[PDB]
Amino acid sequence: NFCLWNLQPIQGSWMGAACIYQMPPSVRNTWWFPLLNTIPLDQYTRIYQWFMGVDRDRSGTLEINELMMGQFPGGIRLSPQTALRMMRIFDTDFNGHISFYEFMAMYKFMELAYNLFVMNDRNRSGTLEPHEILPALQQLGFYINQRTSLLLHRLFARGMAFCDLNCWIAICAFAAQTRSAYQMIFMNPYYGPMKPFNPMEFGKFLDVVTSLLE
Amino acid sequence: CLWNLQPIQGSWMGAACIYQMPPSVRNTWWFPLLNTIPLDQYTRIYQWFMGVDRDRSGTLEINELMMGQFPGGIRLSPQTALRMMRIFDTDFNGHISFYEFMAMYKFMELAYNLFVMNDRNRSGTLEPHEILPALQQLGFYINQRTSLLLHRLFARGMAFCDLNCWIAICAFAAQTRSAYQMIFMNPYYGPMKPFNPMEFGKFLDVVTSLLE
Ligand SMILES: [Mg+2]
Ligand code: NA
Numbered sequence: 407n408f409c410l411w412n413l414q415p416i417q418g419s420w421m422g423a424a425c426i427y428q429m430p431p432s433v434r435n436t437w438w439f440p441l442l443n444t445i446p447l448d449q450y451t452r453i454y455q456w457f458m459g460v461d462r463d464r465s466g467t468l469e470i471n472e473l474m475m476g477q478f479p480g481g482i483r484l485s486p487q488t489a490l491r492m493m494r495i496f497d498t499d500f501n502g503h504i505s506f507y508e509f510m511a512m513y514k515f516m517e518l519a520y521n522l523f524v525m526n527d528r529n530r531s532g533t534l535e536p537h538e539i540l541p542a543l544q545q546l547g548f549y550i551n552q553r554t555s556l557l558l559h560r561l562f563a564r565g566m567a568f569c570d571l572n573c574w575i576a577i578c579a580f581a582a583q584t585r586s587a588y589q590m591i592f593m594n595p596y597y598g599p600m601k602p603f604n605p606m607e608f609g610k611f612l613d614v615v616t617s618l619l620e
Numbered sequence: 621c622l623w624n625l626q627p628i629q630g631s632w633m634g635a636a637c638i639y640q641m642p643p644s645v646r647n648t649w650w651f652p653l654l655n656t657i658p659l660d661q662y663t664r665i666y667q668w669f670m671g672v673d674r675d676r677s678g679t680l681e682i683n684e685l686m687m688g689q690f691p692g693g694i695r696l697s698p699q700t701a702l703r704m705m706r707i708f709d710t711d712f713n714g715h716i717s718f719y720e721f722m723a724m725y726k727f728m729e730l731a732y733n734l735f736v737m738n739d740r741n742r743s744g745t746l747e748p749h750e751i752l753p754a755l756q757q758l759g760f761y762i763n764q765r766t767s768l769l770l771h772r773l774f775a776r777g778m779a780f781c782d783l784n785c786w787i788a789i790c791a792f793a794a795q796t797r798s799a800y801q802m803i804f805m806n807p808y809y810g811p812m813k814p815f816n817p818m819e820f821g822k823f824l825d826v827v828t829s830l831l832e
């Protein structure tokens with residue numbers, strides 16, 4: 407339902423079966439590509455309409471200041487800091503621009519992360535306490551240990567006691583950004599033939615890397 | 621450079637002393653720093669270490685580390701002291717061994733000497749654009765964007781990089797080298813590749829971006 411690594415394509419997706427292979431391999435081959443096939447036709451049309459409207463120079467890309475104008479699921483408004491992390495899930499060579507398919511995926515990633523926060527606010531307090539962060543990330547497919555969980559709150563909560571939607575979205579941006587970093591590292595053919603993605607093993611990477619931000 | 625340190629005559633250990641070092645010391649990336657410490661420097665570090673190790677545990681904790689008088693007047697903030705500990709302490713023990721300290725100290729002196737070498741106008745500061753070549757000389761093959769971020773991350777708003785900023789930078793780079801070992805010694809990735817500075821630099825660039 408929420409696992410980033412095995413999102414089922416939906417009925418009534420905006421793409422027909424052959425369209426998948428019309429996508430450039432650049433998009434096709436990415437870890438986040440399955441997000442695209444969970445977007446229904448009407449959400450696609452809406453996202454497309456928006457992007458064309460902000461894309462005043464007709465470049466086919468957004469940069470961070472256009473991204474921050476976005477009207478995101480749950481009324482999420484992006485901080486500069488979080489918008490940068492979000493761009494960097496997709497912009498892995500610091501162009502400072504994302505494509506339309508990358509934006510589509512970012513938007514659907516935000517919706518999934520929103521929905522997940524709401525699902526986990528079982529007591530309807532409107533926030534997550536820091537000890538609630540770990541099982542929620544686990545549902546998304548990020549397997550971390552308790553120390554990494556509590557450091558994530560520290561790092562991204564801007565001093566607040568609990569984890570509001572803004573802090574959750576920053577944590578999820580960082581976690582996905584880190585997933586793209588892992589790809590970029592291990593894409594390097596110096597490491598030899600690439601091992602398949604394993605969430606348990608990735609989690610150890612996320613633990614070690616999160617420590618470095620302290 | 622950091623990965624290819626020349627042995628010095630008058631090292632504090634003789635040739636047989638090297639094979640009696642503990643395996644958890646011998647098989648680290650930083651081991652070769654130890655054989656660059658002259659005899660008189662050893663007895664100095666030894667004497668100091670024994671002095672601050674108040675309960676005679678044979679270990680050093682962060683508060684005692686921060687009492688150190690380091691090369692060139694370096695003073696470690698709590699945050700830089702933590703990074704320094706983490707080069708060595710990679711499983712959150714909260715302390716380091718005598719030998720781990722010796723290595724940290726010599727690492728500091730190496731960074732200091734390199735700072736001096738690159739401070740061409742003896743201003744006691746490096747300009748942002750001067751950071752990259754000095755890091756390359758140390759063995760950290762990073763790109764310009766990475767160098768400028770490291771400055772901005774660690775400079776406390778200053779436009780320049782003083783020695784204390786330089787050591788914070790160096791601590792982070794070294795900390796990341798230990799992290800690299802941590803990640804890659806996981807049997808899932810297979811036998812670790814021989815260390816390569818050019819490939820490690822790419823890692824350091826990617827990881828540094830995550831801090832922004
Ligand atoms: Mg003690
Ligand atoms: Na709650």
Ligand code: NA
Binds near residue numbers: 738740741742743747
């Ligand atoms: Na200077």
